Structure 1
Amino acid sequence: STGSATTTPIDSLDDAYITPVQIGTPAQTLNLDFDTGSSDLWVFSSETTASEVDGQTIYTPSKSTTAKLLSGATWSISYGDGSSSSGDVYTDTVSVGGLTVTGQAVESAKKVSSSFTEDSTIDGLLGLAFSTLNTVSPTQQKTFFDNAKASLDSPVFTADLGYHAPGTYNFGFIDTTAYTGSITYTAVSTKQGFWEWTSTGYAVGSGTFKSTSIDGIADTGTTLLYLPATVVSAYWAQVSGAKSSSSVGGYVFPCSATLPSFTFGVGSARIVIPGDYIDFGPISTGSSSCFGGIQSSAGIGINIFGDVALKAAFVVFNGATTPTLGFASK
């Protein structure tokens, strides 16, 4: 089998992407944030504290003839950025772009933190990292990909995120029309539960490529590109007037600037992020200070190849026995 679904930016800055997902019988369609940096499929629901719902579409398991309470199971997730959610668990039928999994764990939120409440466009998360990070207790549950994998034509999914435009998540096949040149594959460590790999270096603008190993994670659920402070300083040094602002929370730059591109290495290959992709707009409405899309990972403990990086590529998440990651230009 295969599946193919369109993923759409939630706003004009590509802060996140939402993908429609069918849950239950009859189908309840929710728009979920596909997240290769976490491993829980959780949703706003009829069980979510009323004051914590503000415009989201909710899953109502009592209206699904295929929903079953997973007795005794609870879940609780605290994301690196301080957001959180928790609740109980149903199994139900979940379909993405025509690919159906029966008995998928659908984690129903009883509580969500304010950042989730405030984003009316995101109805939940669909985790695509390794199932070892799944938070359901006392019996850990599998991700949608892990459940689907054996049935797929090939044990892979691909992320093709758009810049200020829709893109695609495919399951089970590689669309050879969706990229240019060749796909370069690179090793993955699953030791921390992530799609963790090592970039071979970087360049700023038309500058020389610096060969240096940068370990990090391919994380569709993170907006920005978080890299070591040395690398990030070298980038922003090429933008007149750029500075790191503790009050704003990272590097900002004059909105009148033209940003240089940023290149990252994948083996001997190179992925070029255009300068425009690194512009996250005014820090507040009407400001002439703009927020940068490349930021230091120093306070995080891991480098993160988030949407800013991934949207410059066609990315293959190869879930074979020894997983790998592939990147192509597009």
Structure 2
Amino acid sequence: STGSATTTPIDSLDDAYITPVQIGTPAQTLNLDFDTGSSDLWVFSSETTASEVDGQTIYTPSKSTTAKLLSGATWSISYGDGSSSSGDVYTDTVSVGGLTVTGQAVESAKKVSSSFTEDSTIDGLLGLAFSTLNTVSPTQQKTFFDNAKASLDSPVFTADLGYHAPGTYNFGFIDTTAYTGSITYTAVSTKQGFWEWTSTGYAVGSGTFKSTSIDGIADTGTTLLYLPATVVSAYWAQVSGAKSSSSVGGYVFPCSATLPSFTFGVGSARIVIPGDYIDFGPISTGSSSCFGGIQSSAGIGINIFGDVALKAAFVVFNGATTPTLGFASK
């Protein structure tokens, strides 16, 4: 089997991407944030505290003939941005882009934090990291990918995120029309439950490439590119008037600037992030200070290749017995 679904930016900045997902029988379609940095499939639901729902589409298990309570199971998750959610668990039929899994754990939110409530466009998350990070207790559950894997034509999924445009998540096949050149594969460590890999270095603009190992995660659920402070300082030093602002919470730059590109290494290959991908616009409406898309990881504890980086590539998440990542230009 295979599946193929379009993913759409939620706003004009590409702050996140949503993908329609069918849950239950008859289908209830929710727009979920596919997150390669977490491992829970959770949704706004008929159980979510009413004051915490503001425009989201909800899953109502009582209207699904295939829903079953997963008795005694609870979940609770905290993300890198300080957001959180928790609740109970149903199993139900879940389809993505024509690929169906029966008996998928669908984590029904009873509580969500303010950042989720305030985002009416995101009806929940679909985690695509390793199932070792799944938060369901007392019986940990599998991701949609792990449940689909054995049925897929190839044990892979691909992320093809657009810049200010829709893109695609494919499951079970690699669309050889979707990228240019060849795919460079690199090793993955699953020790922390993430798609963790080591970049071979970076360049700023037309500058020379610096060979240096940068361990980090491929995380579709993170908007920005978070790298070591040395790398990030080297990038922003090439932008007149850029500075790190403790008041704003990262590097800002004059909205009048033209940003340089940023290159990262994948083995001997190179992925180029155009400068415009690094512009996240005014810090507040009407400001002439703009927020940068490359930020320091120093206060996180991990480097994160978020959407700023991933949208510059065609990315293969190879879930074979020995997992690997692949990157191609596009």
Q: Sort the TM-score into its range (normalised by shorter chain).
A: over 0.9
User: Residue by residue, what CA displacement relative to the aligned partner does 1:261-296 show, whole Å, maximum 9, x if unpaired?
Assistant: 000000000000000000000000000000000000
Which structure 2 residue ranges, 5 or more long, are not aligned? none
Tell me the distance in 1 between the aligned counterparts of 2:16 and 2:125: 11
User: Residue by residue, what CA displacement relative to the aligned partner does 1:166-219 show, whole Å, maximum 9, x if unpaired?
Assistant: 000000000000000000000000000000000000000000000000000000
Pairwise CA RMSD: 0.2
Which structure 1 residue ranges, 5 or more long, are not aligned? none
User: Residue by residue, what CA displacement relative to the aligned partner does 1:147-171 show, whole Å, maximum 9, x if unpaired?
Assistant: 0000000000000000000000000
Aligned residues: 330
Tell me the distance in 2 between the aligned counterparts of 1:5 and 1:179: 17
Tell me the distance in 2 between the aligned counterparts of 1:91 and 1:181: 41
Shift of 1:76: 0.2
Specify the SS of the correspondent of 1:230.
helix
Tell me the distance in 2 between the aligned counterparts of 1:211 and 1:162: 28
Specify the SS of the correspondent of 2:94.
strand
Tell me the distance in 1 between the aligned counterparts of 2:12 and 2:125: 20
User: Residue by residue, what CA displacement relative to the aligned partner does 1:111-141 show, whole Å, maximum 9, x if unpaired?
Assistant: 0000000000000000000000000000000
Tell me the distance in 1 between the aligned counterparts of 2:269 and 2:158: 18
Tell me the distance in 2 between the aligned counterparts of 1:269 and 1:80: 29
Shift of 1:232: 0.0
Runs of 4+ in 1 over 3 A off after TM superposition: none
Specify the SS of the correspondent of 1:145.
helix
Specify the SS of the correspondent of 1:93.
strand
Specify the SS of the correspondent of 2:150.
helix
Pairs within 5 Å for 1:86-235: 86-235=86-235
User: Residue by residue, what CA displacement relative to the aligned partner does 1:72-108 show, whole Å, maximum 9, x if unpaired?
Assistant: 0000001111100000000000000000000000000
Specify the SS of the correspondent of 1:326.
strand
Specify the SS of the correspondent of 1:142.
coil
User: Residue by residue, what CA displacement relative to the aligned partner does 1:7-64 show, whole Å, maximum 9, x if unpaired?
Assistant: 0000000000000000000000000000000000000000000000000000000000
Tell me the distance in 2 between the aligned counterparts of 1:201 and 1:80: 24
Specify the SS of the correspondent of 2:309.
helix
Tell me the distance in 2 between the aligned counterparts of 1:217 and 1:253: 26
Partner of 2:301: 301
Shift of 1:223: 0.0
Partner of 2:244: 244
Specify the SS of the correspondent of 1:62.
helix
Shift of 1:230: 0.0
Partner of 1:267: 267
Give the share of equivalent positions with the same residue, in percent: 100
Shift of 1:304: 0.1
Specify the SS of the correspondent of 2:72.
strand
Specify the SS of the correspondent of 1:257.
coil
Specify the SS of the correspondent of 1:309.
helix
Moved more, 76-85 or 311-320: 76-85
Return the TM-score normalized by structure 2: 1.00
Tell me the distance in 1 between the aligned counterparts of 2:6 and 2:79: 25
Tell me the distance in 2 between the aligned counterparts of 1:322 and 1:166: 31
Tell me the distance in 2 between the aligned counterparts of 1:261 and 1:78: 33
Tell me the distance in 2 between the aligned counterparts of 1:204 and 1:287: 26
Partner of 2:278: 278
Tell me the distance in 2 between the aligned counterparts of 1:190 and 1:144: 17
Tell me the distance in 1 between the aligned counterparts of 2:237 and 2:253: 10
Specify the SS of the correspondent of 1:103.
strand
Tell me the distance in 2 between the aligned counterparts of 1:199 and 1:215: 6
Tell me the distance in 2 between the aligned counterparts of 1:256 and 1:22: 43
Tell me the distance in 2 between the aligned counterparts of 1:237 and 1:263: 16
User: Residue by residue, what CA displacement relative to the aligned partner does 1:211-250 show, whole Å, maximum 9, x if unpaired?
Assistant: 0000000000000000000000000000000000000000
Shift of 1:322: 0.2
Tell me the distance in 2 between the aligned counterparts of 1:217 and 1:249: 22
Tell me the distance in 1 between the aligned counterparts of 2:99 and 2:91: 16
Tell me the distance in 2 between the aligned counterparts of 1:110 and 1:144: 21
Shift of 1:314: 0.0
